[PDB]
Design a protein around this ligand. Structure first.
Ligand SMILES: CO[C@H]1O[C@H](CO)[C@@H](O)[C@H](O)[C@@H]1O
Ligand SMILES: CO[C@H]1O[C@H](CO)[C@@H](O)[C@H](O)[C@@H]1O
Ligand SMILES: CO[C@H]1O[C@H](CO)[C@@H](O)[C@H](O)[C@@H]1O
Ligand SMILES: CO[C@H]1O[C@H](CO)[C@@H](O)[C@H](O)[C@@H]1O
Lengths: 133, 18, 16, 133, 16, 133, 16, 133
């Protein structure tokens, strides 16, 4: 698919993603904090449609992600991210998508998620996260 | 080095590209 | 802590 | 004077400042790199005029600041930054301003300047720098 | 705030 | 179990762990690098015996861990780390233990594991990792 | 990259 | 002179240096903190004698260095560090040595000094500092 790399910022304000309970995660877009002001990251969209939109608005800066988890698996012969769950110090958002396949989870004891990168074709093929103090 | 700042990066999860 | 990233800061130089 | 804080970025692409060789540094503005794209920082202007403009365009990312030096001292009753010199891995820019007073210098063996904060009234009162790997 | 250096820490994995 | 926290160092030179093919991971000790000098971490031992010892000697500094993975599961009513696998830029060490339960994995694109903390009773209850550039 | 951790270093001050 | 590099640690607990009222700084040695335990750094000694020793015992971890300043100048044909002053959040230690020549100062708004490196012959030729969050 089409690779993307948002880079690192100073925090996360909002996350917008879409999914399909029969396939995987589709679109992914984040509104970051850039030194106290909102910064709208590019919208990384799937090549197809039919996904259910989801908006995660965090109460920045008191609320922040403490754990990201989800599932990866095969869909149409491709290994992709099928589900995502975001747990903050105030609430748990998700799971969004199909909770089937191989789970993964990244609990953060000290530090913050400040950026995302990955690739999206029909679905989110893979993603990585920038971490900072 | 280069003039580009760096940060820790974890992943990727999903398709194995590394 | 908070949801805001930290960075090393040196200074200031000039007036107190 | 009026305080300012640009915050932290990915690197430095251009520095625009003004100075008066017989007094001190006046205006200060930085064009930062924000994950591969230029980010125009706010122009921090002196309350008075009569300054000589200077544009420092760096060959980002192969060229970067390795040392910042200058002088502080009185201009009338105010202690301000009278002069600044920027030394990169490729050239030396400056000195700009009064090269007399109390010297200061920040050589960097490992790391990068990724942001500026300070205060400007008639002249640059003081400034600090954000450092990162 | 403190005189102790800090580092990013991920985990834990295992018993909660 | 008994909690431990090695803290953060400059790198990793060797990992000494023990495991049992039918239960989980037992003893855990790391020889870190401390500014170019080997630093022997405290040996965190299981309260019981019968484990098979393994010594992972890395070709420091050219060889480093790029991914840590494993499984967490129930053993005698306790949720513990049942298996561990260490993948470096040169080889794959493991899996050691039993690959049954819930998998977890931490791939690193940029950065290094520089320390460990956790708890060990009969087996490795849980563990966390310090990351740094 | 190598397996050796890095930190910001400022200086040197004194002789060149 | 003889170069030295202590590397980076978790913090600083005690600094022992010596100076001569007519020349410059001689010996330099630091007791660092390494993940909560004192770690005695190598004593970097001058080739000659006749210095006055000084012990700076910090109330770690509540007390930490916020600014290092001093003077560099020519002594018998060599440019060396003639004086040093350490300011913590609790008090000022120094100046020690000769306050003449070219001043330098490193105030820290955010971060910590976690290591030292440099060179010492008859006197302290030069030094750099490791900084971290
Ligand atoms: C049918 O193909 C598309 O979608 C998959 C999964 O997203 C990608 O791997 C692939 O390269 C294409 O972009
Ligand atoms: C005459 O006053 C102004 O300029 C000086 C120097 O810049 C500032 O310190 C001060 O607050 C005012 O803004
Ligand atoms: C039988 O108990 C022991 O071992 C388990 C697993 O290691 C620990 O959780 C527990 O606290 C005890 O130390
Ligand atoms: C007389 O020389 C010595 O002392 C000076 C100053 O310390 C060093 O620079 C030099 O290399 C020698 O070690």
């Amino acid at each position: 698919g089409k690779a993307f790399d948002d880079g690192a910022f100073t925090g996360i304000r909002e996350i917008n993603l879409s999914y399909n309970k029969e396939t995987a995660i589709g679109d992914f877009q984040v509104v970051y904090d850039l030194n106290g002001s909102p910064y709208v990251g590019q919208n990384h969209k799937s090549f197809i449609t039919g996904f259910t939109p989801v908006k995660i608005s965090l109460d920045f800066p008191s609320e922040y992600i403490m754990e990201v988890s989800g599932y990866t698996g095969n869909v149409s012969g491709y290994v992709v991210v099928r589900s995502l769950t975001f747990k903050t110090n105030k609430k748990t958002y998700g799971p969004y998508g199909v909770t089937s396949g191989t789970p993964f989870n990244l609990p953060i004891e000290n530090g913050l998620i400040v950026g995302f990168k990955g690739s999206i074709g029909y679905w989110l093929d893979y993603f990585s996260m920038y971490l900072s103090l | 080095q280069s003039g580009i700042s760096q940060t820790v990066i974890v992943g990727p999860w999903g398709a194995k590209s590394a």
